[PDB]
Design a protein around this ligand. Structure first.
Ligand SMILES: [Ca+2]
Ligand SMILES: [Ca+2]
Ligand SMILES: [Ca+2]
Lengths: 237, 237
């Protein structure tokens, strides 16, 4: 079973089998939290305006620009606020920056697209292995072409767990991700040292970092199951 | 001093101060070997075609596509062959797949561009610290949008040495590079597990890997000093 980590997305990159998309602070952690709270589905849109379009339907609008909730949205991108929100049985539309680009990119060629985080890591890894036939790839969203220490650490936790579950053939990115995991046995340390955590502290949202540093506290795995208009439709596996 | 590592190049990425460009297997190692052999200058172009335009009496053309010497070139990209080449006092023109383009990307904005490898690591790190005033960035060439374990290990060796010289404030990429260095006590293991080493084995050029794994065997540091047409002009510092 090949094990691959792409440290940043690339328009030209292709995925032959499974792809675990990671934006641990915060988009993919928030996505899992909404499904853990019972949301019927998550619609990930490619832009703020595209999410604003559902603003009339029976949905909850969640998202951020610069990490902060847009004035017309119901919720921001905090996974803590997502987990406690009244969304059971509801469709949540999410508009986030780095995370949606990565998912739309992987969705271009992958057979399966899963949204992974430290929060749902063991369940996400187990489903990836169950669905894979030749490769489990992990795509780290990073930020604007530069890799994130937090996403790579998460990819290292996933890579290590996948190795615990069965044999794996890693390539370079996966060896890099495992090295990042080995260097930070503490998930909260790896995440708190990251640029994404500092960005949240600069806008007063650092309380979200410990939530994102939780490991395997949810079995909710968003899986790409369809598309409507510009939205990718994720459902709980 | 800020310490930055970009795990892969990006067209829009900018560098405010010093950049150490790394393509350890093999372009930046080969660059240093040519200067160790006495070459007067290295002209790095961004394509085979542009390198060929510099053909002239006593000019040596070196390079590769798919790791192999192109038909019209004098030498390929082996650092062993570069070190033993008849290049004393001559201009060596090079075009390679990853490294020479990465240098052009950094040179668009950097104040200083140095070509770094394990082979000249300590001299390169010392020169970067001497020239820097606000930041030393290390640009890993990788391969076609994906990070290389070998370039990141090399960046970690450089990052560690820069830290011996004074205060460093690392960002995410630099912490990833240092984690890769810590994960591999033997530079030959990081390099021989890398996709770049396996790609050389596919075409029978793997004898160059041990050469690339030498640490601080040369004091020759190619430093950017000019540009003529499509060639970046590097001289021995
Ligand atoms: Ca992020
Ligand atoms: Ca290379
Ligand atoms: Ca030109």
């Amino acid at each position: 079973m090949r094990l691959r980590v792409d440290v940043i997305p690339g328009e030209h990159l292709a995925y032959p089998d499974v792809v675990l998309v990671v934006d641990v602070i915060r988009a993919t952690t928030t996505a899992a939290a909404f499904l853990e709270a019972g949301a019927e589905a998550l619609y990930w849109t490619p832009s703020l305006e595209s999410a604003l379009a559902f603003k009339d339907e029976d949905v909850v609008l969640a998202g951020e620009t610069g990490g902060l909730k847009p004035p017309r949205f119901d919720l921001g991108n905090s996974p803590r606020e997502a987990l406690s929100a009244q969304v059971a049985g509801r469709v949540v539309v999410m508009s986030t920056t780095n995370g949606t680009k990565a998912a739309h990119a992987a969705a271009r060629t992958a057979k399966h697209v899963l949204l992974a985080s430290l929060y749902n890591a063991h369940a996400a890894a187990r489903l990836a292995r169950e669905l894979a036939t030749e490769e489990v790839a992990i795509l780290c969203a990073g930020k604007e072409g530069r890799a994130g220490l937090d996403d790579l650490y998460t990819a290292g936790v996933l890579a290590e767990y996948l190795g615990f579950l069965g044999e794996v053939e890693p390539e370079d990115g996966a060896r890099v991700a495992l090295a990042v995991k080995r260097a930070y046995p503490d998930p909260l340390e790896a995440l708190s040292l990251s640029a994404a955590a500092l960005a949240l502290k600069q806008v007063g949202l650092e309380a979200d970092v410990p939530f994102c540093a939780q490991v395997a506290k949810s079995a909710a795995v968003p899986v790409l199951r369809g598309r409507v208009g510009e939205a990718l439709i994720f459902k709980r596996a």
